[PDB]
């Protein structure tokens, strides 16, 4: 038993971390076979970042601009492109050490493990859940640029996320990996900001459930409600709506609990009214909402990966 | 910027998880070059866990007994032995993937990481505190014995910890690397339980500091306490003393945020004797204690491992 934010391990991607510079500007880069991958804006400097065109800034670019370090090992760049807002670096060596792997885009509410790296190095490793406003609560320093995000699924690596900035609340934005930015932030310095951002109430039931296989159960009642009746109740609260997907998602927690779903509603409605009047769950005073359903049948059941 | 419960990078311990079988017993092992460590409990059946003694069960097994997976291969066990609550169990072949690595005991109320494993792959990793009362809250389910506990320095896996057991509260025990229980549980099924536990002071001030550095300030004050009159308002919240020491080690924080530790305990005594009054500190709503200031600095200055 027990519950913890719990990350991928890491050990298939830090196998691909790479350092990349171009003038005076390093970060992190992805090597998958030949092909290194990291944010357009390393050819960028100082005065670049401001309002820059980087099909001009590119083009005068050449391969030998490019430093790529995979350890105190240094990789030949022989070509050079720009997908949307990623680089894709070719070398003369393919990564002996490549999982399997894709590129996928993952939906707000969505979660995924985040390899922080610097200088292509790996410091540490957490989950993080795609927000509804399409950022990402992270923790990131200067230099972390080009750090990945990852799921596992058995032996293949669904790589969602590459990180690019830090908006004016401390949160985070980037790219899947094939340049295209989640949410409406881009690679310029703008006044860009995050947006309103809404709970991601599915979750919130799924930790719900999480806690009642834990043997925290005061939050229970005997009531039952709605679903149009508990999505009154989360509008005005800033919990985004239950939708019967949502329900059928949640079948599964339900079953094995005995707890209906529309009953866990009737008990999130009540915490939400009320509060939790110096109580816990799962070591926490606020509700929960990064774990998806997926997450707490992987962690309550326990799925390993190989 | 931000703040996570961040783990070390997992994959240098990845490459040292195999499973273990003596039996109808499967569970994790440790493989450093041509040494397997596990469980001694792996020898024991269901009626053997109940009053056991081990030497006796041991002297009964040969080499054979134990069959060791590494991934798809298995090793051939040459010898095998007891140390403590560990079995040593000498393979024929050296692990290629062993990282240069120490066997160290912590202690309470310094953190972990933990590569949760099943059938000896790798499921999720995670940080830990150990508890002033030698537990560990963490998340394991049946078959994750043997599953171990790390820091890493630069290129240095110190293993700390091995999963061995859950007690009724939910919370976990287990040992060090050489077999040595942490606290006063013994790897035979008795009534043994947790005991009380306190929160752990100096990381609580390590983690407000953190939230400084990350911009929440609306917990600071003008007033200050003295060491004595805050120990004072320790002891009555369940909070272990400070110590000098404890201050000397909160002095690198103190001296980055300008905010006396005198003057953050100032704060903490408000916190306890007011609570929070609906607000947030890097989203909680609970005074967090397993962030040591060295899990703080890190975090919020950037060391990388390698
Ligand atoms: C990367 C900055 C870079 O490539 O130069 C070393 C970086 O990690 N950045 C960043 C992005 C945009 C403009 C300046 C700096 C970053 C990312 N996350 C958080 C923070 Cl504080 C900075
Ligand atoms: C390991 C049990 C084992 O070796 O048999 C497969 C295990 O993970 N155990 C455990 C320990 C002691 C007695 C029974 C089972 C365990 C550890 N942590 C949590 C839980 Cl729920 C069980």
Redesign the interface.
Known sequence: ????????????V??CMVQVTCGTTTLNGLWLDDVVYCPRHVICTSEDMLNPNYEDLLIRKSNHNFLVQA?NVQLRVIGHSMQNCVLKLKVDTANPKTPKYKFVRIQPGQTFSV?????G??????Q?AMRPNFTI???????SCGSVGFNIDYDCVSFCYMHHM?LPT???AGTDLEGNFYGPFVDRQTAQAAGTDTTITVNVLAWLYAAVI??DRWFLNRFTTTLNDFNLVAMKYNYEPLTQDHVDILGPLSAQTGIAVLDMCASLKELLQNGMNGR?IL????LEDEFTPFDVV?????????
């Open positions: 038993s027990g519950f913890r934010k719990m990350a991928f391990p890491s050990g298939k830090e196998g350890g390899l922080a790296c610097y200088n190095s790996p410091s540490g490793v957490y993080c609560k992270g923790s990131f320093l200067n230099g830090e401390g949160v985070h834990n043997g816990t070591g926490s005073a606020l992987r962690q309550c059941s326990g799925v390993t990966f190989q």
